[PDB]
Design an enzyme around this catalytic site. Structure first.
Site, PDB file in Angstrom:
ATOM      1  CG  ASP C  56      -2.080   0.950   1.085  1.00 21.86           C
ATOM      2  OD1 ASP C  56      -3.024   0.641   0.330  1.00 21.86           O
ATOM      3  OD2 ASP C  56      -2.054   2.008   1.743  1.00 21.86           O
ATOM      4  CB  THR C  89      -2.762   5.162  -1.816  1.00 24.07           C
ATOM      5  OG1 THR C  89      -3.996   4.646  -1.300  1.00 24.07           O
ATOM      6  CG2 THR C  89      -2.214   6.184  -0.855  1.00 24.07           C
ATOM      7  CB  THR C  90       0.649   3.825  -5.705  1.00 28.05           C
ATOM      8  OG1 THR C  90       0.730   3.010  -4.530  1.00 28.05           O
ATOM      9  CG2 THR C  90       2.035   3.982  -6.300  1.00 28.05           C
ATOM     10  CG  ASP C 393      -6.167  -1.081  -0.018  1.00 26.26           C
ATOM     11  OD1 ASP C 393      -6.427  -0.375   0.979  1.00 26.26           O
ATOM     12  OD2 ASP C 393      -5.102  -0.984  -0.661  1.00 26.26           O
TER      13      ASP C 393
HETATM   14  N1  LIG Z   1      -5.795  -7.309 -13.865  1.00 31.61           N
HETATM   15  C1  LIG Z   1      -5.339  -6.102 -14.272  1.00 31.61           C
HETATM   16  N2  LIG Z   1      -4.956  -5.894 -15.550  1.00 31.61           N
HETATM   17  C2  LIG Z   1      -4.501  -4.699 -15.967  1.00 31.61           C
HETATM   18  N3  LIG Z   1      -4.388  -3.625 -15.168  1.00 31.61           N
HETATM   19  C3  LIG Z   1      -4.740  -3.692 -13.863  1.00 31.61           C
HETATM   20  C4  LIG Z   1      -5.244  -4.964 -13.331  1.00 31.61           C
HETATM   21  N4  LIG Z   1      -5.511  -4.757 -12.029  1.00 31.61           N
HETATM   22  C5  LIG Z   1      -5.203  -3.465 -11.750  1.00 31.61           C
HETATM   23  N5  LIG Z   1      -4.740  -2.835 -12.844  1.00 31.61           N
HETATM   24  C6  LIG Z   1      -4.313  -1.418 -12.915  1.00 31.61           C
HETATM   25  O1  LIG Z   1      -3.122  -1.220 -12.157  1.00 31.61           O
HETATM   26  C7  LIG Z   1      -3.152   0.080 -11.571  1.00 31.61           C
HETATM   27  C8  LIG Z   1      -2.423   0.074 -10.236  1.00 31.61           C
HETATM   28  O2  LIG Z   1      -3.325  -0.196  -9.168  1.00 31.61           O
HETATM   29  P1  LIG Z   1      -2.728  -0.401  -7.691  1.00 31.61           P
HETATM   30  O3  LIG Z   1      -1.337   0.178  -7.685  1.00 31.61           O
HETATM   31  O4  LIG Z   1      -2.916  -1.835  -7.265  1.00 31.61           O
HETATM   32  O5  LIG Z   1      -3.664   0.547  -6.792  1.00 31.61           O
HETATM   33  P2  LIG Z   1      -3.007   1.521  -5.693  1.00 31.61           P
HETATM   34  O6  LIG Z   1      -2.472   2.668  -6.514  1.00 31.61           O
HETATM   35  O7  LIG Z   1      -4.161   1.878  -4.793  1.00 31.61           O
HETATM   36  O8  LIG Z   1      -1.945   0.678  -5.033  1.00 31.61           O
HETATM   37  C9  LIG Z   1      -4.614   0.475 -11.448  1.00 31.61           C
HETATM   38  O9  LIG Z   1      -4.801   1.801 -11.943  1.00 31.61           O
HETATM   39  C10 LIG Z   1      -5.372  -0.507 -12.318  1.00 31.61           C
HETATM   40  O10 LIG Z   1      -6.058   0.192 -13.358  1.00 31.61           O
HETATM   41 MG   LIG Z   2      -5.055  -0.278  -5.512  1.00 34.52          MG
END
Ligand SMILES: Nc1ncnc2c1ncn2[C@@H]1O[C@H](COP(=O)(O)OP(=O)(O)O)[C@@H](O)[C@H]1O
Ligand SMILES: [Mg+2]
Ligand SMILES: Nc1ncnc2c1ncn2[C@@H]1O[C@H](COP(=O)(O)OP(=O)(O)O)[C@@H](O)[C@H]1O
Ligand SMILES: Nc1ncnc2c1ncn2[C@@H]1O[C@H](COP(=O)(O)OP(=O)(O)O)[C@@H](O)[C@H]1O
Ligand SMILES: [Mg+2]
Ligand SMILES: [Mg+2]
Lengths: 172, 533, 536, 525
Positions: C56, C89-90, C393
């Site tokens: 996170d 958040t990232t 989350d």
């Molecule tokens: N199965 C998937 N295939 C392609 N892209 C994805 C998938 N799951 C999440 N993503 C993309 O990856 C990006 C990063 O999300 P993540 O970093 O996990 O959220 P956070 O920023 O809250 O940690 C998201 O914007 C999402 O659109």
């Molecule tokens: Mg996320």
């Protein structure tokens, strides 16, 4: 806040006793500082009174070397003893750094010191001789190394012979 | 009950600073790890897609290059096993001149697989025996993998094409131009006699105009000026003197003993007359360029200027010998006029400036001579040094070609074929050595794997494609650099070829280093103490 | 030093702007490696050996020691995004840092910061409008598959990503369990009412969803039973101990014969209170205060479970779920002390369950309301903590999807579409705000670039193909269905993410854009810094 | 990281690997380029640098500023090296090389951050640089008729353009004419040592002069020198390498006598040797005597008695210039002082120049050398003036060697950027982005000129881009008029080789910087 022309006048002549005592003490520290400064910085970069009055005394025509040590020191001490047995005319001696109170850098990185005095001046300031001499070389190696620079000098009685000026006169 | 005392025996008698590593886990695995680490540091600079590394040595001198031997030399390696592998790499550099990174990578892969074999249960003896057997098998196989031969060394296009691959790993962007330069320089040297001298190639680094302005000169170029006022000669007749250009003097002690006023008044006049006579006698032989190895006297310089003689003062004896070889003169030990045979001849000698550097050029119009010079230009000292390293690699490759004219396909094709055939051989071999033989065969994959990793493509796809193609029957197929996806092509058609002798020596030295490292079982390290050099 | 004569350091002009942009870039690059399914977790050491394995962004930025105040600004930006949304958040930190970097690059070209700020505000407004008008999918046409896909998308890049097919189902069931409506009829989902208990041991698959409530507490005494087949729960907010007279009351004895009676009453008061409580048939007694030995013995003799030192929030949740009433005191409006059965909560079963050498209370199938709790099992404590963070989350994501019934395609499709639209739209607004909006659109492309580069793939080619697809969708009315084309990091090719089931709540993107724009605007205002030396 | 029982490299070795290393290298290059950013164009400023000893240097030259900076970053030192390269090969444009290299690196930094393989970037730089160099070569304006007046005008305009960035820019016409006149007198090799530059304190810049001969400071006159005449109307100059003094015949010489008559004879013989040398010098007809070796007081008095001028301890360079001007020969022996080895200048004179005495050899008709006498109010003023004169002299020398010019003020940069962009529109697309980035980076020069001049760089750049698109290859930044103008018609001319070398060196530096992926720093020895 005025009177910059203080003109202390009678003061210095009325308290000259304490001033001269402090001057004598400061000068006494000064000879020690001058003696110790000849080793630090001058060669490092590239009781104390006993040492001071031993260096001050004795003839300028006899080479006298001193060793600074802290508790391979033992091997070099043995070689120095062997040289003393081989060179009676020389007056090999050693003294601790803590007694002199030298700098911390000399204590930490200049433990083996080969300080040679000839007439009150440093004709040789071999410091940290570990690299250019070794750790377990014998007395002959040290003798050859010191004689290569022309610093060290070039029968046996029963036990002793020595004992008015009238030697012997048979004149009637 | 709070401290563990040292074990009685050797542990107590050990010196205060010494270390003792004994056994398999404590010594062999650590040595293998150190060798793997060194191979990892040097791996990324392999192949045409290899990357230069800025290495700053203990003297704060900047080295930027992808030459493995140079990088290892500039690095302060401390582990004895990595030291041994570095010695093997330097030996390969001295013997052949190219393949040092191959040696290091192969040794690292061999030691990693040896560690794996030791872990699965094999002992050191079986691994060493299998490695030696597989090395002998590879040396037997290698002559059968030769695809073509040089078949001509006096040509320019053929030599340039042959040398392109050697200087393709270094200076990948512009290799054809450097290949042509080195080919011309090497063809000028290497006369009808089969002997070729590497030292006869001279590299002069003049800074300012970029490496595209580099050129080859048939003669010598010295970065200095002329003592006299003559700066250009069109029919030079160089006379070379090792002695200083001055009146000869005694060896014990020369004392001018004057006993009368006449001698005092006539001594200087007689000395000047003698010097003038010597210089005029030198000039009367037709010599119009004089090269001295010592200092130049003021009176001698004056009389040389009076008779229109070009004076060049070479300081180093090596330069004097090289100039004598180039011009064709003899280094006279005295100031006597030269005979016809000792008199040198050059097409043109003149003073000129390149960029902001004043140089003296001994230029031959003919396309011959004992020594040829490559004038390297550039916008940076480090860039010119790297180009000089590439030139050295090309010259060493030409020398190897003169020694042995056989070539093998590049781009990992030879390594894949060797791995396939050694794997096939190891299947038939019974006993415990089959595992070691198979691991030795698999260790050849590190070269195509490194090439694929550096080129930016997946290595496993390249390896699978190479195995499929070699199983089909094409033994001259390696990975294609000019491709965004894992692809292969025929190396013989593309002309990507490396010397057979280099591969043979590299394999032999890498195997020897690996087995020698494996043979060590105990390490008794003394106190590091000092020893700056 | 100088004519100003201030006891502190000063930075003016491009120096302070470069410092702020460098700090923002440092914060961005710290967490840039942990974005997207091909992202990797991070391991933090707290100088005393404590290890915090996490993915996170909010946790990473909160645990770090940050000194530069623009870096702080980004840290509390991430914290605000976590508190107000729970996801992205990232992404918000990365977007804000990229916006600041491009704004500073524009400023270095003698573009005034006011024009850049105005362009950024206009671009953010138009991006929000475009998202709300063109890039939303209503969840009423999907049902439960949209919730499952949103939960799985949230769980990607987390330690439970591969087990999404099970974890998403558990999360959806847990969220639907605690659903209830309030005034005006709007159904709201009170996440953080789902108690999450971490306990190492069995694998992740043995994580269980309790159809009730789980207490991290044990029975007070070993004599009382550890299982009730028909729970009559009575929740108390007062301790059951020997009655001690208040501070303003003293006992002064002049007749010795009264001391024994006083001492007897001192405990008979609590005895009578306990008898009143037990006479109504209660089987489970939960209290926030402590219980001493005599009261525990009374409960043991009554054959009723008694738990002490129950957390106040847990007690409130149990009372809400089981229909019980919190009683801080036993005093009715008649001036007496009475306990009525109407305050008794009812549950189907209460068990002193054992979980990996430790024991906990399970209240199963409470009536009058449905509650849920999740017990996570992992290899060790760090794995369980990461599981809990990822689970929270996912719960927040499901909450956002259920509250606002609109979702957006994931995998950077929204970012690419916004970049194309804003780049096209910037040509019709002003002169230098044109450049500002163009830089905003370009900065929005950092998310797909990071997603592609995290997979060790050709980011340039993938982003170019995505931009080409979105441009063709925008310029061709008949190809309007290409808006859903996103990034497939498993194969490194564009893919219809709406069809593939990659969804995100619209509020996540909207809030991320708004917060990142405001943070970038706030940082861009600075042109001079005075750093007074500390007085010590 | 785990502690190995025996570490691989020496302890304290620092290694940086990967994309962060290259990004840091680009940032360091930007930092270095920022140190010379404001010293570009006619509105450029000067930098003051104080060394450890406390001495201060003031310069507008980029190469000097970079050299005086103690740059230790391995990647940043490449910028200093290429600045020195441009100074050595050309002498002008030492700021443009650094600006262009840093702009290339900054433009490709975003693509590096995305993971694009650096070999592609290197290939793109090589292709773009080759195309730009070819374009410069085939669009440079040259005139194939080589008239003396037209060549004079071309050289003067080039010198003016090279000089219109320093503190002597107000008198750029005067100094440009002086530079052209000085350069034309060099015969074939154009040696810099044949152009003396003397700095004398006190006086306005307009008081600086170029002498059609040689001039050097008075060198420690002995007693009796003031009695010698200080003006000759047709002197014959004896250029000598001789020590005219009473001294031992040789260092190892020893005289052994056993008679007072022999003692007197020896003393008289030494005196006769000295007087014989002096008489041989005098009978040659020469009136001015110069020597590298000291001339004693006895010889000075002898020459004074004969109405002759003497000067000892004259430096080697001054005597070489005097020989090249008057047309004599430096004689180490005075035994043959024939008339063909004696110099001849029309007028020799010793004059007071700003608190110092200088000897002037004017009126040489066939002189192949010249001496600059630069006046100023401070030592650093004179040093910066000398640096500007050196830049102008190098530019004029290059123009003499090859008279091909391109309009300055960023016009050539904008034309090259337009051509490279237009080429980039016609390639598949992976190299297109890199070539477009190169073309955009080519715009740094006019943007920096506008920024230093205090303009609005965006509007001027837009106008320049539109003008180049619609036609006109010589449109650049007009500093005085706050706008753009045809720089070729404004006589803002620079040699084409200056821009050619600048582009080549910047491209090579950028390619070398990008090619590095990992750096190692061994511990201090
Ligand atoms: N199965 C998937 N295939 C392609 N892209 C994805 C998938 N799951 C999440 N993503 C993309 O990856 C990006 C990063 O999300 P993540 O970093 O996990 O959220 P956070 O920023 O809250 O940690 C998201 O914007 C999402 O659109
Ligand atoms: Mg996320
Ligand atoms: N154009 C090319 N295409 C594919 N492989 C090449 C090419 N040029 C050279 N190679 C490979 O690169 C290897 C040379 O690597 P190099 O960096 O020279 O290491 P070393 O200096 O140790 O030989 C050769 O084995 C050859 O097969
Ligand atoms: N009068 C002028 N008008 C417009 N531009 C000029 C003028 N004079 C010089 N320049 C430009 O200023 C730039 C910098 O030149 P200068 O500062 O003299 O040396 P350097 O190139 O070493 O910085 C040149 O590229 C030139 O095009
Ligand atoms: Mg090689
Ligand atoms: Mg200039």
């Amino acid at each position: 806040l005025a009177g910059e022309g203080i003109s202390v006048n009678t003061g210095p002549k009325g308290v000259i006793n304490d001033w001269r005592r402090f001057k004598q003490l400061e000068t006494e520290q000064r000879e020690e500082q001058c003696r110790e400064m000849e080793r630090l910085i001058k060669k490092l970069s590239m009781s104390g009174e006993g040492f001071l009055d031993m260096i001050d005394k004795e003839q300028k025509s006899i080479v006298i070397m001193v060793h600074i040590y802290e508790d391979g020191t033992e091997a070099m001490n043995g070689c120095m003893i062997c040289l003393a047995a081989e060179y009676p005319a020389v007056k090999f001696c050693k003294v601790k750094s803590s007694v002199i109170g030298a700098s911390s850098q000399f204590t930490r990185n200049a433990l083996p010191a080969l300080l040679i005095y000839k007439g009150g001046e440093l004709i040789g300031n071999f410091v940290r001789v570990t690299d250019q001499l070794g750790d377990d070389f014998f007395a002959v190696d040290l003798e050859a190394f010191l004689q290569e620079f022309g610093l060290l000098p070039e029968v046996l009685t029963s036990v002793r012979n020595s004992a008015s000026e009238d030697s012997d006169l048979e004149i009637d | 009950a709070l401290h563990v005392p040292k074990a009685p025996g050797f542990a107590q008698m050990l010196k205060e600073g010494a270390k003792h590593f004994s056994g398999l886990e404590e010594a062999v695995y650590r040595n293998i790890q150190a060798c793997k680490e060194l191979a990892q540091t040097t791996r990324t600079a392999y192949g045409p897609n290899g990357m230069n590394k800025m290495v700053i040595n203990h003297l704060e001198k900047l080295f930027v290059t992808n030459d493995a031997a140079t990088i290892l030399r500039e690095l302060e390696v401390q582990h004895p096993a990595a030291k041994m592998i570095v010695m093997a790499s330097h030996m390969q550099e001295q013997e052949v001149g190219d393949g040092t990174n191959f040696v290091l990578v192969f040794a690292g892969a061999l030691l990693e697989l040896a560690e794996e074999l030791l872990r699965i249960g094999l002992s050191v003896s079986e691994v060493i025996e299998g490695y030696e057997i597989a090395c002998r098998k590879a040396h037997e196989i290698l002559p059968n993998l030769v695809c073509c031969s040089a078949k001509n060394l006096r040509d320019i296009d053929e030599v340039s094409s042959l040398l392109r691959t050697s200087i393709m790993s270094k200076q990948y962007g512009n290799e054809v131009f450097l290949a042509k330069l080195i080919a011309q320089a090497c063809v000028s040297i290497f006369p009808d006699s089969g002997h070729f001298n590497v030292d006869n190639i001279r590299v002069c680094k003049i800074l300012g105009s970029g490496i595209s302005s580099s050129s080859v000169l048939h003669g010598m170029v010295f970065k200095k000026e002329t003592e006299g006022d003559v700066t250009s000669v069109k029919d030079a007749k160089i006379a070379v003197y090792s002695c200083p250009f001055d009146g000869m003097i005694t060896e014990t002690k020369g004392t001018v003993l004057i006993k009368t006023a006449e001698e005092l008044m006539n001594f200087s006049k007689g000395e000047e007359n003698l010097m003038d006579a010597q210089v005029k006698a030198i000039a009367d032989t037709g010599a119009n360029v004089v090269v001295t190895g010592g200092k130049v006297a003021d009176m001698a310089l004056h009389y040389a200027n009076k008779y229109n003689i070009m004076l060049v003062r070479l300081n180093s004896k090596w330069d004097l010998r090289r100039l004598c070889k180039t011009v064709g003169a003899t280094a006279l030990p005295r100031l006597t006029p030269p005979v016809l045979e000792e008199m040198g001849h050059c097409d043109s000698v003149y003073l000129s400036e390149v960029g902001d550097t004043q140089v003296v050029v001994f230029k031959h119009e003919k396309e011959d001579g004992a020594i040829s010079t490559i004038v390297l230009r550039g916008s940076t000292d480090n860039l010119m040094d790297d180009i000089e390293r590439a030139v050295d690699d090309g010259v060493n490759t030409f020398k190897v070609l003169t020694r042995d004219k056989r070539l093998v396909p590049g781009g990992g094709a030879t390594e894949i074929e060797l791995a396939k055939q050694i794997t096939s051989y190891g299947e038939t071999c019974p006993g415990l050595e089959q595992y070691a033989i198979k691991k030795f065969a698999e260790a050849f994959e590190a070269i195509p794997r490194a090439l694929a990793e550096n080129s930016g493509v997946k290595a496993n796809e390249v390896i699978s494609k190479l195995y499929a193609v070699h199983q089909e029957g094409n033994k001259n197929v390696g990975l294609d650099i000019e491709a965004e996806v894992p692809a292969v092509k025929d190396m013989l058609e593309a002309g990507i070829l490396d010397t057979y002798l280099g591969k043979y020596w590299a394999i032999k030295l890498a195997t020897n280093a690996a087995v020698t490292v494996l043979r060590v079982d105990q390490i008794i390290m003394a106190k590091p103490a000092g020893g700056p050099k | 030093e100088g004519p100003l004569s201030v006891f502190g350091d000063r930075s003016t002009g491009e120096t302070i702007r470069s410092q702020n942009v460098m700090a923002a870039a440092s914060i961005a690059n710290i967490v840039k490696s942990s974005l997207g399914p091909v992202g990797l977790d991070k391991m933090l050491v707290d100088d005393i050996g404590d290890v915090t394995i996490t993915n996170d962004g909010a946790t990473i930025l909160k645990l770090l020691e940050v000194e530069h105040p623009a870096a702080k600004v980004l840290c509390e930006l991430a914290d605000l995004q976590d508190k107000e949304v729970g996801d992205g958040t990232t992404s918000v930190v990365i977007i804000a840092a990229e916006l600041l970097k491009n704004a500073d690059e524009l400023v270095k070209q003698k573009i005034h910061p006011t024009s850049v700020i105005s362009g950024y505000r206009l671009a953010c407004k138009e991006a929000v409008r475009y998202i709300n008008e063109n890039l939303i999918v209503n969840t009423d046409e999907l049902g439960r598959d949209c919730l499952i896909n949103a939960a799985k998308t949230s769980m990607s890049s987390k330690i439970i990503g591969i087990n999404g097919d099970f974890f998403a189902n558990m999360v959806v069931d847990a969220v639907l369990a605690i659903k209830y409506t309030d005034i005006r009829g709007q159904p709201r989902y009170p996440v953080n009412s789902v108690n999450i208990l971490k306990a190492h041991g069995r694998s992740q698959m043995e994580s269980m969803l309790i159809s009730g409530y789980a207490l991290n507490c044990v029975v007070g005494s070993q004599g009382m039973p550890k299982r009730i087949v028909n729970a009559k729960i009575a929740c108390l907010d007062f301790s059951l101990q020997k009655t001690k007279m208040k501070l303003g009351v003293q006992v002064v004895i002049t007749d010795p014969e009264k001391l024994d009676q006083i001492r007897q009453r001192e405990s008979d008061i609590t005895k009578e209170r306990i008898q009143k409580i037990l006479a109504t048939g209660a089987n489970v007694i939960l209290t926030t205060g402590g219980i001493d030995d005599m009261c525990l013995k009374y409960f043991v003799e009554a054959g009723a479970m008694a738990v002490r030192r129950v957390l106040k929030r847990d007690l409130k949740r149990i009372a809400k779920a089981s229909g019980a009433t919190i009683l801080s005191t036993l005093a009715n409006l008649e001036g007496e002390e009475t306990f009525e059965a109407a305050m008794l909560g009812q549950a189907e079963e209460v068990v002193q369950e054992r979980i990996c050498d430790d024991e906990l209370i399970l209240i199963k199938n409470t009536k009058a309301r449905t509650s849920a709790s999740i017990i996570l099992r992992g290899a060790n404590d760090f794995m369980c903590d990461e599981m809990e963070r990822s689970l929270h989350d996912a719960l927040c994501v499901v909450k956002r999807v259920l509250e606002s019934k609109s979702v957006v395609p994931g995998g950077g499709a929204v970012e690419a579409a916004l970049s194309i639209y804003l780049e096209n739209y910037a040509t019709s607004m002003g002169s230098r705000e044109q450049l500002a909006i163009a830089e905003f659109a370009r900065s929005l492309l950092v998310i797909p670039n990071t997603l592609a580069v995290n997979a060790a793939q050709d980011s340039t080619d993938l982003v170019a193909k995505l931009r080409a697809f979105h441009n063709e969708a925008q310029v061709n009315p008949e190809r309007k269905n290409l808006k859903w084309i996103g990034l497939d990091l498993s194969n490194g090719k564009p893919r219809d993410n709406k069809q593939a089931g990659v969804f995100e709540p619209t509020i996540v993107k909207v809030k991320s854009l708004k917060f990142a724009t405001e943070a970038a605007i706030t940082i861009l205002r600075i042109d001079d810094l005075i750093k007074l030396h500390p007085e010590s | 990281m785990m502690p190995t029982p025996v570490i691989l490299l020496k302890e304290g070795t620092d290694s940086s690997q990967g994309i962060p290393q290259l990004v840091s290298n680009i940032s360091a290059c930007q930092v270095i380029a920022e140190a010379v950013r404001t010293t570009l164009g006619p509105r450029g400023m000067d930098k003051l640098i104080v060394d450890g000893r406390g001495k201060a240097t003031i310069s507008n030259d980029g190469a000097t500023i970079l050299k005086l900076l103690d740059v230790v970053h391995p990647a940043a030192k490449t910028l200093v090296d290429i600045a020195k390269s441009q100074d050595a090969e050309v002498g002008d444009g030492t700021t443009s090389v650094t600006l262009l290299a840093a702009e290339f690196l900054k433009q490709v930094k975003p693509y590096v951050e995305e993971g694009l393989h650096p070999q592609i970037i290197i290939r793109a730089f090589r292709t773009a640089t080759q195309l730009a160099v070819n374009k410069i070569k085939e669009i440079a304006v040259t005139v194939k008729k080589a008239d003396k007046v037209e060549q004079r005008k071309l050289l003067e305009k080039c010198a003016m353009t090279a000089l219109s960035s320093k503190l002597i820019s107000q008198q750029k016409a005067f100094f440009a004419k002086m530079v052209v006149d000085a350069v034309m007198m060099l015969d074939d090799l154009l040696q810099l040592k044949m152009i003396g530059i003397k700095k004398v304190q006190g006086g306005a810049l307009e008081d600086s002069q170029l002498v059609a001969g040689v001039a050097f400071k008075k060198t420690f006159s002995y007693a009796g020198f003031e009695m010698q005449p200080k003006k000759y109307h047709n002197p014959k100059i004896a250029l000598l390498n001789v020590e005219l003094e009473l001294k031992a015949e040789k260092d190892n010489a020893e005289i052994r006598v056993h008679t007072v008559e022999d003692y007197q004879a020896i003393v008289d013989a030494e005196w006769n040797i000295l007087y014989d040398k002096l008489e041989k010098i005098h009978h040659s007809g020469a009136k001015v005597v110069l020597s590298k070796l000291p001339i004693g007081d006895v010889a000075t008095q002898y020459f004074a008695d004969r109405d002759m001028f003497c000067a000892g301890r004259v430096p080697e360079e001054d005597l070489k210039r005097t020989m090249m001007a008057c047309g004599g020969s430096i004689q180490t022996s005075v035994n043959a002082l024939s008339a063909d080895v004696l110099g001849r200048c029309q007028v020799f004179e010793e004059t007071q120049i700003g608190g110092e005495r200088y000897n002037f050899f004017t009126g040489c008709p066939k002189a192949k050398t010249c001496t600059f006498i630069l006046r100023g109010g401070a030592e650093q003023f004179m040093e910066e003036t000398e640096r500007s004169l050196h830049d102008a002299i190098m530019i004029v020398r290059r123009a003499i060697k090859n008279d091909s010019v391109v309009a300055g003020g960023g016009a050539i940069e904008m034309e090259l950027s337009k051509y490279l962009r237009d080429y980039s529109r016609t390639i598949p697309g992976k190299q297109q982005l890199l070539i477009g980035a190169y073309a955009k980076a080519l715009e740094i020069i006019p943007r920096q000129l506008c920024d230093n001049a205090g303009f609005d760089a965006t509007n001027i750049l837009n106008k320049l881009r539109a003008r180049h698109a619609q036609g006109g290859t010589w449109y650049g930044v007009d500093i005085n008029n706050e706008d753009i103008a045809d720089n070729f018609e404004a006589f803002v001319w620079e040699p084409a080789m200056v821009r050619i070398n600048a582009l080549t060196a910047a491209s090579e530096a950028a390619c070398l910087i990008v090619s590095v992926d990992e750096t190692i720093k061994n511990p201090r020895s």
